[PDB]
Amino acid sequence: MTEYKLVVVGAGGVGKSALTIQLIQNHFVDEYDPTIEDSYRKQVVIDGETCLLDILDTGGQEEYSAMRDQYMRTGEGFLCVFAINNTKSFEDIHQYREQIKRVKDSDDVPMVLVGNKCDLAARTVESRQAQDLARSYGIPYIETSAKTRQGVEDAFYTLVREIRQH
């Protein structure tokens, strides 16, 4: 069957693991255990197609990691995640996109910008600001809540639909 290699990246604590775990295991992780690199696999049907999602959940990073770059090289699509209540995480997105461009050696890599923790009221990143950033990259912007599951399936499935247009 068709396999889709997805990689989740973004600043520490934005909810990358919570999003992946909500998608794959249907529960919300309340505690904060920093990730290095964890992988998840699951067969799902997306738009009538039975396929296998292979998801690499990476941890936030502010220091070079040769190993990190190597694990990311095989990714086919990337979820770039920031949290809507953490301006710095949004400002960090451009660096993650640059890392992706490097490891893939391409300026055209399937990606989706995700603004997580949309259930929280302390918003410092407005939807419009994120929409503008995503537009500049030629990619979709989707808000999510790993807590309520709002937009979770939408974010990952949209990433699959982006790989399909590639």
Residues within the interface to ligand GNP (CB under 6 A): 12-18, 29-32, 34-35, 59-60, 116-117, 119-120, 145-147
Question: What is the nearest approach in angstroms of Ca ion to the Cβ of residue 21?
Answer: 13
Distance CA 49, CA 105 (A): 29
Residue with smaller CB distance to Ca ion, 73 or 94: 73
Question: Can you give the binding site for Ca ion, defined by CB under 5 A?
Answer: 31, 33, 102, 105
**CB nearer Ca ion, residue 17 or residue 158:** 17
Nearer to ligand GNP, 29 or 44 (CB): 29
Quick check: 17 binds Mg ion (CB under 5 A)? yes
Q: How far is the C-alpha of 73 from the C-alpha of 76, rounded, in Å?
A: 8
**What is the DSSP track for 97-140?**
HHHHHHHHT-S---EEEEEE-TT-S---S-HHHHHHHHHHHT--
φ/ψ bin of 133: left (φ > 0), alpha (ψ from -120 to 50), beta (otherwise): alpha
Tell me if residue 24 falls in helix, strand or coil: helix
Q: How far is the CB of 73 from Ca ion (least distance, A)?
A: 8
Q: Which is nearer to ligand GNP, 52 or 120 (CB)?
A: 120
Residue nearest ligand GNP by beta-carbon distance: 15
Query: What does R_g of the chain's alpha carbons equal in angstroms?
Result: 15
Q: Which residue has the tokens 């992706």?
A: 100
Report in angstroms how near the CB of residue 48 gets to ligand GNP at its nearest: 29
Q: How many residues bind Mg ion (CB under 5 A)?
A: 3
Q: Which is nearer to ligand GNP, 2 or 124 (CB)?
A: 124
The HSE-up count of residue 115 (CA atoms within 13 Å, CB side) is 26
Candidates 29, 35, 61, 164: give the one binding Mg ion (CB under 5 A).
35
Q: Are strands 49-58 and 37-46 parallel, antiparallel or unpaired?
A: antiparallel
Please give the residue ranges that form the binding site for Mg ion (CB under 5 A).
16-17, 35
